[PDB]
Amino acid sequence: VAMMLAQLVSDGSPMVRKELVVALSHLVVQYESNFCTVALQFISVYTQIWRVLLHLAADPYPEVSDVAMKVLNSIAYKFISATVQTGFCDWSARYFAQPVMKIPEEHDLESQIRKEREWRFLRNSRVRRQAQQVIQKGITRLDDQIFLNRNPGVPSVVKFHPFTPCIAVADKDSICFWDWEKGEKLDYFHNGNPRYTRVTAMEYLNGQDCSLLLTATDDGAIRVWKNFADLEKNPEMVTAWQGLSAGMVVDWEQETGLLMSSGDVRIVRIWDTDREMKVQDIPTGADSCVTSLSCDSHRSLIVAGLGDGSIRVYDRRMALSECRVMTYREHTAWVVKASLQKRPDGHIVSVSVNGDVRIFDPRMPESVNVLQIVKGLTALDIHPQADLIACGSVNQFTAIYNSSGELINNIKYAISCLAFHPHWPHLAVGSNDYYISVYSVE
Amino acid sequence: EADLTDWNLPLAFMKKRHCEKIEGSKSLAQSWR
């Protein structure tokens, strides 16, 4: 029976992990001698059980890690030196106390919940709608700098709040929230990851209502946070787990509601938040590691860039052998950036150290168009639903053009991060000098 | 309609398992015996 423990370590469910630690304790309480001997030697079922115990001790989720720390003392120092228990069953039994024969107020079509949800959706729809009018009245120009300020630490990554005039700037281990309309800070937080780790990416989740925050850690881990927006409330964690070995690269599909992850390996993995269990695992197929990855909403095309300069497009529906469907080999060096547009007609935009910004179509094996700004780029950005592309330069030069190459804006600042605003044309630029600024319409 | 698209989007992690503290049910001062 004991062989089953190691299999469930891959599940993201923190509660299942805590109960798995409890089961480890209940199994080891009867055969403590072997584990004590092995531990004293280290200072094959039992060896792998101890290994998964080590992994659970390294769990980013505080509760499972704490239970593992308490459990370990019962082996190394050996009388039952440690006691453990959890209240999953009682919390579940709490179900039958609540009313059963009444419709919840949340489903009434005149409660404040429905009104608030509808009003927030109206706000989001208005924000989305005004973008078309702003852009289609003649290309607006970003000559007006609205915000410019400094902060402690290099700004590693910057993200826009989808429906609020504020940005989140994150570094190896900490995050700061700054409203560029006010030009004033909103809040400060620490990710909690230690010195040996760094934040490889940042992302927003559930932007339509009650948005959450996500962080990817180069240790192969993912963390989620809430309550980071209110000034009067402290942020709280939502979920956390390590499931994988550019470091770590993560993409999210709210429309498809799926998380996808990869890194310096030949593997891509897919997770569903609701079931908390991995849904699919696709090998890269090629012999080179992945550098970047972006995919489509509700369609099977998965586009990835590899370290050998090749760009691969997979159809995730079919088997692994038939998974690969489309290959581009034009750049000679590794792929600096690659992205797939979710526009009605599929398009792909890639750039490498060669300096050739190439645009391809899924139905052709060759670049549709080629352009150049400078050999080697620090930041590249493409507007979601507009003919706008922004490129910075290491020479402190930055510009915004059309996809045809026509220049729209030229700026001189050392740019570390640069990004667009999805709906209302704005450009955020943070330099290697801790300085973050934003440019707005007119 | 954009409102319809927002209604269609899922709400990840927004279930009772993640949202509320996991603890036992409090006892009560029963004296009916």
* Residue of A95, A125, A250, A385 to mutate when probing chain B, most B C-beta within 10 A: A125
| Contact between residue A422 and residue A162 where contact means Cβ atoms under 8 Å apart | yes
The DSSP output letter for A108 is -
Strands A347-352 and A397-401: unpaired
Strand order in the sheet with A174-179: A157-160, A167-170, A174-179, A184-190
**What are the residues whose beta carbons fall under 8 Å from the beta carbon of A338, sequence distance 6 or more?**
A292, A293, A294, A303, A304, A305, A311, A348, A349, A350, A351
Least CB-CB distance to B25: which of A93, A205, A273?
Answer: A93
> How many whole angstroms separate alpha carbon A8 and alpha carbon A12?
9
**What are the residues whose beta carbons fall under 8 Å from the beta carbon of A24, sequence distance 6 or more?**
A5, A49, A52, A53, A56, A71
What residues of chain B, 1 to 33, have a C-beta less than 8 Å from chain A?
Answer: 1-3, 6-7, 9-15, 17-18, 22-25
The residues of A whose Cβ lies within 8 A of any Cβ of B are 15, 86-88, 90-91, 93-94, 97, 118, 121-122, 124-125, 128-129, 205-206, 208-210, 212, 224, 238-239, 254-255, 257, 273-274
Closest CA to A289 of A311, A312, A307: A307
Look up tokens 């998380």; give the residue.
A259
Query: What are phi and psi for residue A405, nearest 5 degrees?
Result: 100, -15
H or E stretch including A148? strand A144-150
> How many whole angstroms separate alpha carbon A419 and alpha carbon A379?
8
* Residue of B13, B17, B25, B26 to mutate when probing chain A, most A C-beta within 10 A: B13
Tokens for A398? 């930055």
- Provide the resolution (angstroms): 2.9
Per CB-CB distance under 8 Å, the chain A contacts of B11 are 206, 209-210
Q: Experimental method used, please?
A: cryo-EM
> How many whole angstroms separate alpha carbon A361 and alpha carbon A351?
15
Cα dihedral sign, A178-A184-A187-A193: positive
